[PDB]
Scaffold this active site. Structure first.
Site, PDB file in Angstrom:
ATOM      1  N   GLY I  57       0.859  -1.230  -0.060  1.00 55.59           N
ATOM      2  CA  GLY I  57       0.117   0.272  -0.062  1.00 55.59           C
ATOM      3  C   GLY I  57       1.038   1.319  -0.070  1.00 55.59           C
ATOM      4  N   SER I  86       5.043  -6.146  -2.338  1.00 50.77           N
ATOM      5  CA  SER I  86       5.210  -4.541  -2.426  1.00 50.77           C
ATOM      6  C   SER I  86       5.972  -4.140  -1.057  1.00 50.77           C
ATOM      7  CB  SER I  86       4.232  -3.660  -2.850  1.00 50.77           C
ATOM      8  OG  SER I  86       3.700  -4.193  -3.966  1.00 50.77           O
ATOM      9  N   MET I  87       5.202  -3.039  -0.345  1.00 53.29           N
ATOM     10  CA  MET I  87       5.651  -2.592   0.688  1.00 53.29           C
ATOM     11  C   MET I  87       5.439  -3.749   1.971  1.00 53.29           C
ATOM     12  SD  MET I  87       7.290   0.279   1.213  1.00 53.29           S
ATOM     13  CE  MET I  87       7.758   0.980   2.601  1.00 53.29           C
ATOM     14  N   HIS I 111       8.200  -5.431  -6.415  1.00 47.87           N
ATOM     15  CA  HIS I 111       7.971  -4.714  -7.719  1.00 47.87           C
ATOM     16  C   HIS I 111       8.258  -3.044  -7.482  1.00 47.87           C
ATOM     17  CE1 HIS I 111       3.360  -3.615  -7.679  1.00 47.87           C
ATOM     18  NE2 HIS I 111       4.070  -3.476  -6.580  1.00 47.87           N
ATOM     19  N   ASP I 160       6.520  -7.207 -12.058  1.00 51.74           N
ATOM     20  CA  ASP I 160       6.189  -8.078 -10.960  1.00 51.74           C
ATOM     21  C   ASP I 160       7.077  -9.235 -10.907  1.00 51.74           C
ATOM     22  OD1 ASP I 160       4.192  -6.196 -10.634  1.00 51.74           O
ATOM     23  OD2 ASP I 160       2.519  -7.563 -10.744  1.00 51.74           O
TER      24      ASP I 160
END
Ligand SMILES: CC[C@H](C)[C@H]1C(=O)N(Cc2ccc(OC)c3ccccc23)C[C@@H]2N(C(=O)NCCCC(F)(F)F)CCC(=O)N12
Ligand SMILES: CC[C@H](C)[C@H]1C(=O)N(Cc2ccc(OC)c3ccccc23)C[C@@H]2N(C(=O)NCCCC(F)(F)F)CCC(=O)N12
Ligand SMILES: CC[C@H](C)[C@H]1C(=O)N(Cc2ccc(OC)c3ccccc23)C[C@@H]2N(C(=O)NCCCC(F)(F)F)CCC(=O)N12
Ligand SMILES: CC[C@H](C)[C@H]1C(=O)N(Cc2ccc(OC)c3ccccc23)C[C@@H]2N(C(=O)NCCCC(F)(F)F)CCC(=O)N12
Ligand SMILES: CC[C@H](C)[C@H]1C(=O)N(Cc2ccc(OC)c3ccccc23)C[C@@H]2N(C(=O)NCCCC(F)(F)F)CCC(=O)N12
Ligand SMILES: CC[C@H](C)[C@H]1C(=O)N(Cc2ccc(OC)c3ccccc23)C[C@@H]2N(C(=O)NCCCC(F)(F)F)CCC(=O)N12
Ligand SMILES: CC[C@H](C)[C@H]1C(=O)N(Cc2ccc(OC)c3ccccc23)C[C@@H]2N(C(=O)NCCCC(F)(F)F)CCC(=O)N12
Ligand SMILES: CC[C@H](C)[C@H]1C(=O)N(Cc2ccc(OC)c3ccccc23)C[C@@H]2N(C(=O)NCCCC(F)(F)F)CCC(=O)N12
Ligand SMILES: CC[C@H](C)[C@H]1C(=O)N(Cc2ccc(OC)c3ccccc23)C[C@@H]2N(C(=O)NCCCC(F)(F)F)CCC(=O)N12
Lengths: 184, 190, 191, 181, 184, 185, 186, 183, 180
Positions: I57, I86-87, I111, I160
């Protein structure tokens, strides 16, 4: 804006030389127009070839069979040429052209799959809808078997999922007769 | 666009469907509403005025639609002098198959892969109990009216028509011929 | 898509849309829901035809679910005003103000084909806002019904009392029942 | 919803055998009222229950859930119309124990025929038509039994919307007394 | 509102009289059907004279683009291409498809190239079929683009991985066009 | 909406095209550019020497569509006069400045606005980078051409086009966007 | 506003204390889970004493209904079924699933039986699978409903083809319930 | 309205007897809850069985694998019982129960099919999405083969389309151990 | 959310377990940051356990969690269960050295950061410079904790990149795959 030639719109000028355009999704309007064009052209001349241009993603099966039956009924040979793409009922109509006169340009895309539909309501209503689309597929596969030379069992297997063919692979399959290669 | 056909005169341009009307061919190629019925009724009245002897050809590629709009066409076909041939190309459903069956005796046709569907009429009612009763009595009488005429034109009994049209009943062109909705399946010209 | 018809004359080919060709033989189409536009056209057609010939009959085709009462009365009054007899023929359906206009045809010249549907009911409407505003709207639609029932009584031969009862709910009639009621004169049977 | 010294107002009223029918009748309202009636029966089978009615009616089946539970249980269920009772609410107002059906002077009582809808095939429309017609016959028969009026009179009087004052509702037999100050 | 010129021609139909075809919009099947029909009409009028394809387009459908591509290569006349305003994606591919030595761009015209775009949904096998199709479509596009530019397929793959904007001069150096048509 | 004039009957704009007047009277999209580019090619083919008159009442729009019109103006042989009536904003004012030397005009109460180009970018950081580098290039391209045609420096145009800069007809002349304010007699 | 009774119970939780479970809504997975959990809780408290299943429901999910059905059959205590207001579709199936001799409806309760509803969309073989699934689901329902009513499977098939509304007395005649529950003596 | 029975809501009372509810579509919220309940129950007692109720149409594969991995990590046997229906990742978790302690009630429905998903954008982005979901299917099908005892070829073919199974058919297939019949 | 009196997640917080089980926004960051500060105040030496089942997010919200993990005295163990993307994968890698975990079938995705910009060319430039700096910031920190070069992380995060638990261990995003 569809251009004018001199006063014919471009597609009406093509119809003057016995060229019919199937250049859209197949609904009843498209089928009524093409069927009417076929009847008009054979009335003008019952011997000369007609040319069916096919750039279509398919559409209604009954609308497709309106065109199919009219092609078979009339005396003139109806040539088919796939330019751009022929998917679903479009590729069926491509294969329905006069034997020896079904064509495609080199980079034209031909796709075959099973018919699509839906049903909602009571269990007996779902059954009636299911029996209908299964009979429709059998009808489609039977004719496609007759025009390609492939067995009904092989058509069933190859139309289970989306099956994208090159113009050359469509020739190998029996959906067309020749890939119309350009002059060097 | 509707394609324009042009013919060399002693060059006259026609839209495709108007050119077909010149040779007594009427197109029922859409859902049956009042507009489609008014057009077809008017065409029938025009063609009988031009010639009361020559056959008229009704092309049918329709999913059906309004029952009253269908009876507008039906009654006009029965009223006029010339024979109205019917030909199913693609599909004839509901009121469309009723009108296919309404063609001149011996001149009701279909191409081999044409689909014919018959079923009971569809409707809706909303409001008070007495209003729902009136609506129900109306659509039931409309079904009796349809089934009685279908029985006369097919040779099937009203009891059999009731049973066969209770649910969606899909028929091939050959099965439609066997049922009595059409007379012949048109096979290819040599 | 309205089809075009092509007639050969001694001056040459003459093209008409199908409905304009029928207007050439004094046939007017009331083939839709009645609104002001439909009434304006039909009223203008009636005025045009009576100017061409004030003696000849005019033919009003009726395949209509009805609609606006005032738009209906535009057609009604113009029919009664002009000298030509206006024949009415119900083909498909005549409901509400459509069946009112069917009954408005010339005496002895109101027809229906065998399977045509005729429906009569009381007028529909709405009112919203203050009590005095609802009262005005209620009095207006009630006088409109009395106006409709009085004229329908005169043209069918039925009493105002019987028309009130028979139009309380939706009342669907066959072509033969419409003849028996006095809404039409004859059922036009096929030869 | 205010609290009283600690009960919410409607739970405090339930402690004194008062049940609130103060909304449109759906299945949730019926389930609540039916459950309250069964609860109050178990607490005391002899003491009266008091059904407050300020309702425009609603679901006929949900109404009959309340009706049958009232007639089933041992205690008398008094009914009182305050504000309005329409349709199924006026049916339930008439369902109260004989001699113990009430309305306040300016309360509004309306009766009409049941409302519904049907859509689909002709045989499906026929089934829905026969259903709602038999539902009206069922409602009119019971209303005839509880008011003293004939089934023929109720049929004619429920054809359209029929608004009654509290006094007119007494004369009709929907209630027994207009509760004066 | 398209202006008219006096027979009465709308401006685009007047340009067609001098063998100029307009590709001035996003490429869908309707645009392809029209352009393909114009190409067939002009070669029927004269099979020797050059045709001129105006390109101000952001690209669009790959199959519709290939309908135009194959029709250009099929017909006998040389089809010149001129980029005015912009040519992106399939529009830049069709710009490179013009007759050898007759692919042009005006000085401030924008040329963009990238890999093809698409979407896939449903079962894992259906997603696999969509992925294999769009990958074969890119190979098909990169092969043709390599042959017409003179660049290696490895280089085309690299340079079309992301959005790659080029000037008219850079497009000439890359091989997408032959000349930057400078003003006299 | 569009009235007809009879002499052969023409709609008002087609009649103006007969006297070599092209209308840029709307937002500049590809369709408008394609039309104007086609008219410029038609008129130069009819007569490669007689002047063309580009009426400009536009709020601007697409930069590529504007450059379609720009490059076609520079390519053809006829002088293309530009006249601002109503307003010329953004790419409309760029095209106003692109007219033939000594033949760029505006009526006294016409509005001329200049600003930096507008755009968008979504997705991955490298995609945003590519989009940002593109529009920055596009602005330099526009500013460099404006500099050449106005006589103002690139760095001055950069500063004056940072925000919305509205100019009167007389101020546009002083800036070099037009040559004369066409005053009434 | 669900009223409280005084430990402070909401009215439905108070009813659960005397082994009464409420099926008073459309049958979805949430309702089924709650009712199945209540049934498991009550058998654990007491494995003999009757449970009472109040039914005022228009039906809903067939699988959610079978969650309730199977839990009723699995547990030792008799589950009395009590139709008040209405029981339609899978609601009337569950009404018929109550302990033999202890299936009730109040005099003016409405019982409706009809065939299951569903949908299918996609390829012909996907429509076939959906059709075979809902047809087998109907046979499964009809077979159980035959066993609990004493009516033949073909009679159930015919009588559930369309919407079939039954009064409480007609439901008793049919075998969907055992008794029309009369008022208590007082 | 969740009924009350100290005073517990019905599901908290069931958790007190080591019963966890998987009665909804599997998303991250449901997985986080079930994983936390498994961690809590094993901390209370590592030897006593846990009972996973399954009435689920499935959902997220990753959220399903959160529950799967936590079942296998903890010491206590997690029984599984299908009541109503177990579809997709729900039936995967049904098959993931302790060996010999996977159940279904007689009229419960079990469905198995291949994973569903979507992809949009560039050809290379679609390729990455296609490679990922195919690896996810092989990952799923291999575990099913091991826990059912069927060959992965048979699992691949039988999960190609929607495949509805009765409780008895699920037992014969190896997805459950017994059909729990009524007393 | 079942009760055990404590709600299940509050009971887990009693044993120093923090749940990052959703998309990362400011509200989730504020909660987790506050839990980290609270657990330090309770005990500055005993380990904290960060459960990670998140698709990532907001990057700034993620960095609120990151800095707070680094600031406090106790080791913050991280465990990926279900998925970290991600995060979420960045914060998975931010756990205490030697105490970053994942269960066998847990999914790890890395990514480059996603963003958006609309308006004037100078505004697009400012937005573009900001997200590019944000990527450099992320890649530099991810390099320090994985042991991979900045060039390799730039390459592997371009598209990705789905990793299994074992592949994530090999990459340096976690230390051990927790076997049953
Ligand atoms: C094989 C046609 C047979 C012979 C027959 C017929 O049965 N029909 C029905 C028909 C209608 C519409 C159709 O798709 C619009 C038909 C399509 C296929 C087959 C029949 C169709 C009408 C036909 N007509 C003609 O074709 N005349 C020639 C003028 C045609 C045109 F287009 F130029 F005006 C009328 C005379 C006639 O006998 N027929
Ligand atoms: C035939 C029925 C009888 C003969 C009668 C008639 O009762 N009517 C009503 C009528 C109107 C509209 C209709 O569908 C639009 C009618 C349809 C069926 C029956 C009557 C219809 C008008 C009819 N007319 C004609 O037919 N003219 C011939 C010109 C026809 C055409 F189309 F070319 F203009 C006018 C003269 C006339 O007397 N009639
Ligand atoms: C009997 C009408 C009387 C005679 C009178 C009249 O009062 N009016 C009003 C009127 C207008 C519009 C109307 O429906 C559109 C009218 C309808 C009914 C009555 C009056 C109407 C105008 C009328 N006109 C005509 O009739 N011209 C004949 C040509 C008509 C046509 F259609 F062919 F062009 C003008 C001359 C005239 O005096 N009148
Ligand atoms: C001898 C009373 C009725 C006829 C009988 C019965 O058949 N039932 C079914 C029933 C359920 C739900 C109901 O509306 C929610 C019922 C409504 C009306 C009739 C029956 C209903 C359950 C009922 N119970 C009770 O009444 N307990 C008392 C506690 C009540 C409360 F509310 F406080 F918990 C359980 C024991 C029992 O025998 N019964
Ligand atoms: C090389 C064309 C080959 C030789 C062939 C052919 O196979 N076709 C199919 C075709 C159709 C539509 C098409 O894009 C709309 C075609 C495009 C490309 C190739 C074939 C196409 C029909 C063609 N016709 C003509 O071209 N005549 C001239 C009139 C053309 C025009 F436009 F002016 F009316 C009919 C006679 C004929 O032999 N052909
Ligand atoms: C001058 C450009 C050169 C000379 C060349 C050319 O390269 N083109 C491409 C072109 C197309 C469309 C264009 O904007 C619609 C072009 C705009 C600018 C430049 C080229 C363009 C076609 C051009 N033609 C003409 O100009 N004919 C004259 C009739 C034009 C009109 F409008 F009346 F029909 C065809 C002959 C020709 O060689 N050319
Ligand atoms: C009877 C089933 C058998 C006995 C078995 C079992 O197989 N299960 C699975 C199960 C779970 C959930 C369920 O609906 C939510 C079940 C429903 C029906 C059948 C099994 C179910 C768990 C069950 N438990 C209990 O019943 N404890 C008693 C506490 C009950 C309550 F509600 F108070 F907490 C745990 C002990 C045990 O062995 N079982
Ligand atoms: C097997 C877990 C191992 C032993 C380890 C661990 O690695 N974790 C991470 C973890 C977090 C969240 C989780 O699902 C929400 C975890 C699920 C599975 C595995 C690890 C999980 C924290 C765990 N804790 C506990 O077990 N406390 C006991 C009380 C827990 C409860 F629920 F009662 F409050 C803290 C102590 C500890 O070492 N661990
Ligand atoms: C460590 C930072 C230092 C110690 C300092 C501080 O600067 N702050 C700011 C701060 C606020 C919010 C925060 O995330 C919500 C902070 C997060 C990280 C760092 C500072 C933060 C407040 C901190 N406090 C405490 O730690 N009290 C203990 C009680 C904490 C809890 F959670 F139990 F209530 C107040 C006293 C104090 O000096 N500090």
């Amino acid at each position: 804006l569809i251009p004018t030639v001199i006063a014919y719109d471009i597609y009406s000028r093509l119809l003057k030389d016995r060229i019919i355009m199937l250049g859209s999704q197949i609904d009843d309007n498209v089928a009524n127009s093409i069927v009417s064009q076929l009847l008009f052209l054979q009335a003008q001349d019952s011997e000369k070839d007609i040319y069916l241009y096919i750039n279509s993603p398919g559409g209604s099966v009954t609308a497709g069979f309106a065109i199919y039956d009219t092609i078979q009924h009339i005396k003139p040979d109806v040539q088919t040429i796939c330019i751009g793409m022929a998917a679903s009922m479009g590729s069926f109509l491509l294969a329905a052209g006069a034997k020896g006169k079904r064509f495609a340009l080199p980079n034209a895309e031909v796709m075959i799959h099973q018919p699509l539909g839906g049903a909602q309501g009571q269990a007996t209503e779902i059954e009636i809808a299911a029996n209908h689309i299964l009979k429709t597929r059998e009808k489609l596969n039977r004719i496609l078997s007759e025009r390609t030379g492939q067995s009904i069992e092989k058509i069933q297997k190859d139309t289970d999922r989306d099956n994208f063919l090159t113009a050359e692979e469509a020739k190998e399959y029996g959906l067309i007769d020749e890939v119309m290669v350009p002059e060097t």
